[PDB]
């Protein structure tokens, strides 16, 4: 719910993120359909050239079950990954809003 979505391609996330009530930092984590356990963070942002865009970051899987976007910090779950980037952008194009 809210932020986690299963069976949402890149283009479906973009359409969702780019909708009216969303702002910069509006995001969603989506799970791959042809590949379970492969996640993607999608964030709505601004490009000086294109305007409102949606940026996609691959969530890497740790062998022990946790995840991470950047090698500098890893998490045990997606909730922790989200809570982190909502309180600091830490490399992300923007801090997520939620």
């Amino acid at each position: 719910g809210s932020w986690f979505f299963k069976n949402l391609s890149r283009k479906d996330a973009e359409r969702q993120l780019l909708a009216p009530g969303n702002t910069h930092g509006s995001f969603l984590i989506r799970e791959s359909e042809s590949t379970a356990g492969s996640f993607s963070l999608s964030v709505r942002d601004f490009d000086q050239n294109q305007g409102e865009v949606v940026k996609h970051y691959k969530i890497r899987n740790l062998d022990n079950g946790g995840f991470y976007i950047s090698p500098r910090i890893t998490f045990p779950g997606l909730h922790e990954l989200v809570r982190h980037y909502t309180n600091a952008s830490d490399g992300l194009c923007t801090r997520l809003s939620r």
Binding site: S40, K55, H56, Y57, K58, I69, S70, R72, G91, L92, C93
Partner: peptide
């Protein structure tokens, strides 16, 4: 495709 992060 995917955004890289340092």
């Amino acid at each position: 495709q995917f955004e890289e992060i340092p």
